[PDB]
Design a protein around this ligand. Structure first.
Ligand SMILES: [Mg+2]
Ligand SMILES: [Mg+2]
Ligand SMILES: [Mg+2]
Ligand SMILES: [Mg+2]
Ligand SMILES: [Mg+2]
Ligand SMILES: [Mg+2]
Ligand SMILES: [Mg+2]
Ligand SMILES: [Mg+2]
Ligand SMILES: [Mg+2]
Ligand SMILES: [Mg+2]
Ligand SMILES: [Mg+2]
Ligand SMILES: [Mg+2]
Ligand SMILES: [Mg+2]
Ligand SMILES: [Mg+2]
Ligand SMILES: [Mg+2]
Ligand SMILES: [Mg+2]
Ligand SMILES: [Mg+2]
Ligand SMILES: [Mg+2]
Ligand SMILES: [Mg+2]
Ligand SMILES: [Mg+2]
Ligand SMILES: [Mg+2]
Ligand SMILES: [Mg+2]
Ligand SMILES: [Mg+2]
Ligand SMILES: [Mg+2]
Ligand SMILES: [Mg+2]
Ligand SMILES: [Mg+2]
Ligand SMILES: [Mg+2]
Ligand SMILES: [Mg+2]
Ligand SMILES: [Mg+2]
Ligand SMILES: [Mg+2]
Ligand SMILES: [Mg+2]
Ligand SMILES: [Mg+2]
Ligand SMILES: [Mg+2]
Ligand SMILES: [Mg+2]
Ligand SMILES: [Mg+2]
Ligand SMILES: [Mg+2]
Ligand SMILES: [Mg+2]
Ligand SMILES: [Mg+2]
Ligand SMILES: [Mg+2]
Ligand SMILES: [Mg+2]
Ligand SMILES: [Mg+2]
Ligand SMILES: [Mg+2]
Ligand SMILES: [Mg+2]
Ligand SMILES: [Mg+2]
Ligand SMILES: [Mg+2]
Ligand SMILES: [Mg+2]
Ligand SMILES: [Mg+2]
Ligand SMILES: [Mg+2]
Ligand SMILES: [Mg+2]
Ligand SMILES: [Mg+2]
Ligand SMILES: [Mg+2]
Ligand SMILES: [Mg+2]
Lengths: 159, 145, 296, 211, 169
RNA sequence: GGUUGCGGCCAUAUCUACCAGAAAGCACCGUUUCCCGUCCGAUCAACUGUAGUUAAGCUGGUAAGAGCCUGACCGAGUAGUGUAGUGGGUGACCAUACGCGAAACUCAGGUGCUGCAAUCU
RNA sequence: GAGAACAGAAAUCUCCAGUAGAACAAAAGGGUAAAAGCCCCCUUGAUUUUGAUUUUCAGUGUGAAUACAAACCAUGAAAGU
RNA sequence: AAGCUCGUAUCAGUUUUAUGAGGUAAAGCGAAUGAUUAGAGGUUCCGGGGUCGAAAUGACCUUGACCUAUUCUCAAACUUUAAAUAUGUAAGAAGUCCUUGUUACUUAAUUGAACGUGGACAUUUGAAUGAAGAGCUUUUAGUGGGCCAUUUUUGGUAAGC
C-alpha cells in the first residue's frame, strides 16, 4: 500500500546539481549567522545530518538560535485555516543569507542619503517607489528610416 | 473575483475610474472577460459626475448637487467644487487617489441603444463587448449614463 | 596516448574537475574543512593555523587565518632566516625545525603584546609541556598545527617545529607520541633523546661517528662543517645561542631588495610569451590552406 | 483474437514502452523499415516523396507491416526492386494492453496485447527516394498504402534531395563545390570546425576553389 | 635530447604461481627468500575455480620485488638461462619486459630434494629518473611523453648493455 | 610581470599533441648513523645541500584541435502554456482573442580570474 | 589494453588508461574519490541525566529523526569527530 | 449565539517591485542510462566456418562480435537544458545611524554575543488597489452516503462506468 516516509518524493530535489557533486566549498562554512538574520533553506543531499524536511525546501525563515554547527530557523507553516510556528534545527550547509532584503537595505541607506541631500538644501524630497508609468509623447523621425511595407505570406511546405 | 472587488466593481454595470500603471494594468488584464473599459473623454467624465456622481461620507453615499459637500471632504487637498473634482480625475492629479476613491462607484443603467453585438462575452476585437475598447468607451457609457 | 585510449566528446563533456588545489595535489580539503571552521557561536573569531611545510630544504612557518576572500598571514618565519641568528648550515634538520618554530612563536607573540608575559620554557630539557594560562591575565595565543600532507610518523620533524612553538610561548595543543624518544612499547617518553634532537644531537653524533670510520663520505657531505671549522661538539652551543639570539630580537628583518618591483617586472616580461589575435590566427590558417592544400 | 484497431486509435494513454517494468511483450509485427536499394548513394536518388500524418493517432505494428508490404510490392513490380528506396519512418514503441477474461472489474490491469507507433500531425510515416523519372510510380505506392491506415494521411513531394536535409539547389551548390562526400547510403559534409590538418586529409577534392 | 633520462631498472619482480597452498607453496616461498635476501609476499586466490583446484583466499602463490644492484645480479643471472635471447613480444608497450624459466636451479642454487624444482616468472619494470613524480604523496603528477618509457627505447636499451638478441619480427 | 607557502571562486582552470622558459624558487636529485615504515629506504622517516639536472614536474605559448564559458531581432515570437467564446470539426483534433514564453539549432567571441605573506634580474 | 615458465576463456606477477562505468547487509532512490568504497591501528558515544525540535498530527500518542545543555569516555599530533 | 478590548487602526483568496525554491509541459538522444532502422570505414597471436597448406603467433576470403565517424526512431517509473500556471520571504518608528554600560557565555584581548542607558531624522515614514473597521474569548447545532461541468488526469475496448 502507500508509502510516506521522511524523504519520500524527494528524488530530484535533494539531488546534487549537474557537475556539482563532492566536497562543499569552504565558503559555506566561513559564513557567519546571527539571530534575526533572514535565511533561505535548501537541502544539500550530500549532508545527511541536520537536514530540513522537504516541506521546508525553498522556504525563507528567520534565525532564532545559534549553535556549534547550526542555526535554528523559525518558519511559519500554515496548517488548517491558520499558521503555526515551526522551529527548525539546520546545519549551515542547508542555509544561506537571503538577498530578499538587500534591496530594502540598499533603498534605506540611499533614502536617508537623498533625504539629507534634499532637506539641508531646501527640500523636494520625493522618495517612494512608483510603478512603471505609461509612455510620454514622442516624435519618431523618418530620415534614414522610411517605413518598409510588409504583407502576410503564402502557404508553403519545406520538407 | 478578488480584483473585481478591489476595483469596487461588485455589481453589474457599475463603473469606477482607474489610473493606469504597470501595477493596475495587470489588474485590468485579470478581468478583461468581465468588463468593458477605455479612455474616457472630458465630455463623459463631466456628465458621469454631474448626473450620477456621489461621495463617500461616513460611508452613506451622498449626492453631489452642492459644492460645499465636496469642499467639506475633498477640500483638504485643494478641490472645492464639482468641476474641481472632474479636473483632478481627468488630469490624473497629484491627489487622484483620494479624489477618485471619494467618488462612489457609478451606477449605470443598461445601454440604451443596446450593446451593438449579439454576444457580449467575447472581446471587443472579436465582435464582443469586453476588454479595452479604447475611445469607443464613451459612446457606450454615454448610452448607459 | 595510444589510439584505443584517449577520450571522447562525452567523457570530457561530463567531466567534473576537482578543486584546483586538489588537481595540484596541494590541498587536503577534508582536513582544511575541519582545521578552519569555527563554532557558529564564536561568530567572527578567527581560528589560526600554525602551518608548517618543508620544501626541498627550506622550512616555512606561517600563522594563518581564513577569509572567504582568501587566507591571511599573521606572521611568517622561514628557516632560511636562521643565518641571522647564528645557524648557517643544516637548515632542514630537526633542530632547524625547532628553531624556526621558536622564531615564529616569539615573533608574533611579540607583535601581539603577549611578549613579556608568556615566555615559555626558557630552559629546554625536553620535558613534556604546553604553556599554561597565567593566573588572572590574558589567555595565551592558541594555535593549531596545519601539518598539510605530512605523514604523521613518530619522529617526523613537522612535530619539531611544533615543539619550538610550544616551547616559545604559543598554546598549541599536542600529545607526546610523535616526538623522537617516545617509546613504542611503553607509554612513556625519554626526554634524554628529545632534548638531543632539539639541540642536534643526532647530527652531531653522526659527525663524530663519521670522523673515524669513513672520511670519504664525511667530506662529501659535512663539507661546509669543515670549511667553517665547526667540528661536532660545538653543535649544541651553536643552536643554544641561536635560541637566545632569537628570543633576544625576533622582530623580522625583510631583505634589502635591490631593483624595484617594477624592475623585476621588466626582465621577467622579457620571457613572458604573448597570446595571439584572431586576425593573426586567421592568417595562420589561410596561410596553411595556401600551403598544405595548394598542392606544394 | 486481435481486437479491432478501432479500440486503440486514439492516444489515450502515456507511452508504455517495453522495459524492465513491462517485460513480457509481443514482437513488433513490422520488423524491416528499409527496403529497396538502400545501399544506393545520395546522388543516385534525388527525388523524395513522403507519406505524412494529418492526425494525432496511433498506428499498429500490423498496419505498419501490412502497409509496408503494399507499397513495397507495387513499387517493385512496376518500377523494379532496385528502383527506389523505401524507409519506414516510424517505430511502434508503445505497448497496448488488454483485460483478457470469476473476477469482474476488480483489479483490471491488462497484459500487453500488441504494439503501436504514436504519430503526430505533420509526422512522416513513410519516406521514399528515387529518380524524378519515377515520381508517379512511387506516389502510387504511397497512395495504395494509405488504404492500410486509419486516419487521414497525405502524400507530399519534398523540396529536399533524397533523404538529405538540403534542398536540391543547395545540395548541388555544396557538392558541385567540393564539400560533400559519399558514405554508406548517406553522406558527409566538410565543416570549417576542427583540426585543419585532418580536415584536408578528408575531402581532398575541396581546397582548390572549384571542381 | 639526453642528460639524465637514463634508463635505470625500476625493480625486478619474481613470481612463482603455484596452483595450491600448504607445504608445496611454503617451499616455493623458501626459494624466493634465499634468492632475494628479502622475505617474500604471498598471494591469495581471487576466486574459486575447481578445475584449478583453488578456493577464494587460499594462498595460491608467492612473489617478491627486488630493486637496486640486487636486481641486476639476478636479471643477469636468469638472462643467462635465457641465453640472452628474448622476443619482440616480451616487451610491453609501456616499456617493461619479462620472461620465465622452468627450474630455478639454473641460477646458482643447488638442488636438495627437500625443496624440489620450481618455475619462476621474471618481470623487469623500467623507468627514468624523476619517476617519483607519479609515485610520491604531494603534487602527484604524470611524466611527459618526452620522458615516458617506450617499447623501442627499452629494446635498444636491452640490445645494447648485456649484448643480448631480441629476435622474431 | 616570475615564483613559493596558505588560499577564494572551482574547466575561460579540464583534455589531446607539440614547442619555449632568463633569474630566483620549486623540483628532480645524493645518503642510511640516528627517530621511523616497508616483501622492496619506490612510497613513508631521517641526514646532506654537499656530488648532479632542466629531462620530467611546474609555468607559458601553438592548434579552421576535443571540452568548457559568454553573447546574439541565429533559430523563434516557434514548441509549450494562463485566460475567453452557444468559435470550426462526426471525431481526432484545430483556428482565433488578451497575455507569458522555451530547448535544440546556427553564428560570433573567449580559454582562469583574484586574496594574504615571503622572495627574484 | 599491452606484457611474464607450466597457465588454457578463467589462477598469480607488472605497467598504462580509467568521473566512478564499482562498492557501501537488504527494496529502490538519493549521496560519496587523499571518501561514505578497500587494508590496517586503537576502541565501546550501541553509554549516563532530563528537556526542546522535525515528519506523520488533533499540531494527541507511537515510531523514526534533528540541534543543543549537564556528565563520563573513545580516538587523533591536532583542529575535531 | 453571546459578546469583550480597541479603533483608523490594523486588515487582504489582488497587482507591482526585489530576492528565492521547483524538474511538470516542451525539448533532447550525431549528451549519460535504456531502447531502436540502416549502411560505410576500421581492428585481431583472440567465436566459428573455408581454399592453400607438414605447420605457423601463416597468407587469403568469410560471417560474426567489438571500435570509428555517420544514419531513421522512442521513455510514467531516462536526461544536460528547461517553461507557463501555481509557490517562500521582503517593501521601516518592533525602522536606520552615533556615543558606550551589564555577564558566570565567548575572545589572544573590554575581543565578541546578547540585553540595554544617552543622542540625531516624522509622515512621499518609503510600491499599488481596496478596507460597511480591526483584534480577541467562550460555548453550542447540524454534518461527517455526496453528485455534476470546463480543464489536468489513473484504471477499463467502453459506459449515463
Ligand atoms: Mg507508492
Ligand atoms: Mg546517523
Ligand atoms: Mg482604482
Ligand atoms: Mg439613444
Ligand atoms: Mg428601444
Ligand atoms: Mg434610436
Ligand atoms: Mg444569439
Ligand atoms: Mg439613460
Ligand atoms: Mg575509448
Ligand atoms: Mg561531436
Ligand atoms: Mg570529484
Ligand atoms: Mg588527515
Ligand atoms: Mg489528452
Ligand atoms: Mg487510460
Ligand atoms: Mg473482464
Ligand atoms: Mg461475482
Ligand atoms: Mg498484479
Ligand atoms: Mg514527442
Ligand atoms: Mg488512410
Ligand atoms: Mg638535461
Ligand atoms: Mg594445483
Ligand atoms: Mg636555475
Ligand atoms: Mg635499518
Ligand atoms: Mg631515495
Ligand atoms: Mg621523507
Ligand atoms: Mg624542457
Ligand atoms: Mg609543484
Ligand atoms: Mg574549441
Ligand atoms: Mg500549434
Ligand atoms: Mg493553451
Ligand atoms: Mg462561460
Ligand atoms: Mg470548445
Ligand atoms: Mg542504495
Ligand atoms: Mg582526505
Ligand atoms: Mg541500541
Ligand atoms: Mg514529538
Ligand atoms: Mg492518544
Ligand atoms: Mg511527537
Ligand atoms: Mg515507520
Ligand atoms: Mg516528479
Ligand atoms: Mg515529454
Ligand atoms: Mg533539450
Ligand atoms: Mg540515448
Ligand atoms: Mg540531423
Ligand atoms: Mg520527464
Ligand atoms: Mg504571490
Ligand atoms: Mg481606502
Ligand atoms: Mg469603516
Ligand atoms: Mg461546533
Ligand atoms: Mg461538533
Ligand atoms: Mg461530530
Ligand atoms: Mg459550471
Amino acid at each position: 500500500g502507500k508509502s510516506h516516509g521522511y524523504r519520500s518524493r524527494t528524488r530530484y530535489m535533494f539531488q546534487r546539481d549537474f557537475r556539482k557533486h563532492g566536497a562543499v566549498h569552504l565558503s559555506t562554512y566561513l559564513k557567519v549567522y546571527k539571530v534575526g538574520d533572514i535565511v533561505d533553506i535548501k537541502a544539500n543531499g550530500s549532508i545527511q545530518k541536520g537536514m530540513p524536511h522537504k516541506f521546508y525546501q525553498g522556504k525563507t525563515g528567520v534565525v532564532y538560535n545559534v549553535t556549534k554547527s547550526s542555526v535554528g530557523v523559525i518558519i511559519n507553516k500554515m496548517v488548517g485555516n491558520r499558521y503555526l510556528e515551526k522551529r527548525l534545527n539546520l546545519r549551515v550547509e542547508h542555509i544561506k543569507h537571503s538577498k530578499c532584503r538587500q534591496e530594502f537595505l540598499e533603498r534605506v541607506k540611499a533614502n536617508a542619503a537623498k533625504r539629507a541631500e534634499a532637506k539641508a538644501q531646501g527640500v523636494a524630497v520625493q522618495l517612494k517607489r512608483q510603478p512603471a508609468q505609461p509612455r510620454e509623447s514622442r516624435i519618431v523621425s523618418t530620415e534614414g528610416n522610411v517605413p518598409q511595407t510588409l504583407a502576410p505570406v503564402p502557404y508553403e511546405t519545406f520538407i | 473575483r478578488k480584483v473585481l472587488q478591489l476595483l469596487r466593481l461588485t455589481r453589474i454595470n457599475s463603473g469606477t475610474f482607474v489610473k493606469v500603471t504597470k501595477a493596475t494594468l495587470e489588474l485590468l488584464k485579470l478581468i478583461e472577460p468581465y468588463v468593458a473599459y477605455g479612455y474616457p473623454s472630458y465630455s463623459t467624465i463631466r456628465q458621469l459626475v454631474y448626473k450620477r456622481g456621489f461621495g463617500k461620507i461616513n460611508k452613506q453615499r451622498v449626492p453631489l448637487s452642492d459644492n460645499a459637500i465636496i469642499e467639506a471632504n475633498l477640500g483638504k487637498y485643494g478641490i472645492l467644487s464639482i468641476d474641481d473634482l472632474i479636473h483632478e480625475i481627468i488630469t490624473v492629479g497629484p491627489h487622484f487617489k483620494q479624489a477618485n476613491n471619494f467618488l462612489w462607484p457609478f451606477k449605470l443603467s443598461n445601454p440604451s441603444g443596446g450593446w451593438g453585438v449579439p454576444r457580449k462575452f467575447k472581446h471587443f476585437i472579436q465582435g464582443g463587448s469586453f476588454g479595452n475598447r479604447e475611445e469607443f468607451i464613451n459612446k457606450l457609457v454615454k448610452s448607459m449614463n | 596516448a595510444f589510439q584505443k585510449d584517449a577520450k571522447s566528446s562525452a567523457y570530457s563533456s561530463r567531466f567534473q574537475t576537482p578543486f584546483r588545489r586538489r588537481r595540484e595535489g596541494k590541498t587536503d580539503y577534508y582536513q582544511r574543512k575541519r582545521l578552519v571552521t569555527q563554532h557558529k557561536a564564536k561568530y567572527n573569531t578567527p581560528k589560526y593555523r600554525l602551518v608548517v611545510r618543508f620544501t626541498n630544504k627550506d622550512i616555512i612557518c606561517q600563522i594563518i587565518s581564513s577569509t572567504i576572500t582568501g587566507d591571511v598571514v599573521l606572521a611568517a618565519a622561514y628557516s632560511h632566516e636562521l643565518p641571522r641568528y647564528g645557524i648557517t648550515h643544516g637548515l632542514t634538520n630537526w633542530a632547524a625545525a625547532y628553531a624556526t618554530g621558536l622564531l615564529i612563536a616569539r615573533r608574533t607573540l611579540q607583535k601581539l603584546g603577549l611578549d613579556e608575559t608568556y615566555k615559555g620554557v626558557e630552559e629546554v630539557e625536553g620535558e613534556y609541556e604546553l604553556t599554561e594560562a597565567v593566573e588572572d591575565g590574558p589567555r595565551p595565543f592558541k594555535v593549531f598545527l596545519d601539518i598539510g600532507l605530512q605523514r604523521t610518523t613518530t619522529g617526523a620533524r613537522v612535530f619539531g617545529a611544533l615543539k619550538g612553538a610550544s616551547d616559545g610561548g604559543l598554546y598549541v595543543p599536542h600529545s607526546e607520541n610523535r616526538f623522537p624518544g617516545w617509546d613504542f612499547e611503553t607509554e612513556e617518553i625519554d626526554p634524554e633523546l628529545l632534548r638531543s634532537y632539539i639541540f642536534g644531537g643526532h647530527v652531531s653524533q653522526y659527525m663524530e661517528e663519521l670522523a673515524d670510520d669513513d672520511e670519504e663520505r664525511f667530506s662529501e657531505l659535512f663539507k661546509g662543517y669543515l670549511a667553517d671549522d665547526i667540528d661536532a661538539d660545538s653543535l649544541e652551543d651553536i643552536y643554544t645561542s641561536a635560541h637566545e639570539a632569537i628570543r633576544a630580537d625576533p622582530a623580522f628583518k625583510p631583505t634589502e631588495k635591490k631593483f624595484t618591483k617594477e624592475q623585476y617586472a621588466a626582465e621577467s616580461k622579457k620571457y613572458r610569451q604573448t597570446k595571439l589575435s584572431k586576425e593573426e590566427r586567421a592568417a595562420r590558417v589561410a596561410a596553411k590552406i595556401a600551403a598544405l592544400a595548394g598542392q606544394q | 483474437a486481435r481486437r479491432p484497431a478501432r479500440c486503440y486509435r486514439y492516444q489515450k494513454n502515456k507511452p508504455y514502452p517495453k522495459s524492465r517494468y513491462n517485460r513480457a511483450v509481443p514482437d513488433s509485427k513490422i520488423r524491416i523499415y528499409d527496403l529497396g536499394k538502400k545501399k544506393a548513394t545520395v546522388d543516385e536518388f534525388p527525388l523524395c516523396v513522403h507519406l505524412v500524418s494529418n492526425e494525432l493517432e496511433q498506428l499498429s505494428s500490423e498496419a505498419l507491416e501490412a502497409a509496408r508490404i503494399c507499397a513495397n510490392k507495387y513499387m517493385t513490380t512496376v518500377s523494379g526492386r532496385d528502383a527506389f528506396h523505401l524507409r519506414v519512418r516510424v517505430h511502434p514503441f508503445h505497448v497496448l494492453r488488454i483485460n483478457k477474461m470469476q473476477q469482474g472489474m476488480r483489479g483490471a490491469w491488462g497484459k500487453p496485447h500488441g504494439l503501436a507507433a504514436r504519430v503526430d500531425i505533420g509526422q512522416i510515416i513513410f519516406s521514399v527516394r528515387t529518380k524524378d523519372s519515377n515520381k508517379d510510380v512511387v506516389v502510387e505506392g504511397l497512395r495504395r498504402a494509405r488504404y492500410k491506415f486509419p486516419g487521414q494521411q497525405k502524400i507530399i513531394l519534398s523540396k529536399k534531395w533524397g533523404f538529405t536535409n538540403l534542398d536540391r539547389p543547395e545540395y548541388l551548390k555544396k557538392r558541385e563545390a567540393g564539400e560533400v562526400k559519399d558514405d554508406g547510403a548517406f553522406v558527409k559534409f566538410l565543416s570549417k570546425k576542427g583540426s585543419l590538418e585532418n580536415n584536408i586529409r578528408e575531402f581532398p577534392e575541396y581546397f582548390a576553389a572549384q571542381a | 635530447q639526453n642528460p639524465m633520462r637514463d634508463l635505470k631498472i625500476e625493480k625486478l619482480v619474481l613470481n612463482i604461481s603455484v596452483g595450491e597452498s600448504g607445504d608445496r607453496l611454503t617451499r616455493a616461498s623458501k626459494v624466493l627468500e634465499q634468492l632475494s635476501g628479502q622475505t617474500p609476499v604471498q598471494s591469495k586466490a581471487r576466486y574459486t575455480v575447481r578445475t584449478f583446484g583453488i578456493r577464494r583466499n587460499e594462498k595460491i602463490a608467492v612473489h617478491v620485488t627486488v630493486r637496486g644492484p640486487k636486481a641486476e645480479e639476478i636479471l643477469e643471472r636468469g638472462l643467462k638461462v635465457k641465453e640472452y635471447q628474448l622476443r619482440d613480444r616480451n616487451f610491453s608497450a609501456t616499456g617493461n619486459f619479462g620472461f620465465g624459466i622452468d627450474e630455478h636451479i639454473d641460477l646458482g642454487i643447488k638442488y636438495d630434494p627437500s625443496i624440489g624444482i620450481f618455475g619462476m616468472d621474471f618481470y623487469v619494470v623500467m623507468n627514468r629518473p624523476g619517476a617519483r613524480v607519479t609515485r610520491r604523496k604531494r603534487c602527484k603528477g604524470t611524466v611527459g611523453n618526452s620522458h615516458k618509457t617506450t617499447k623501442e627505447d627499452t629494446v635498444s636499451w636491452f640490445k645494447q648493455k648485456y649484448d643480448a638478441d631480441v629476435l622474431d619480427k
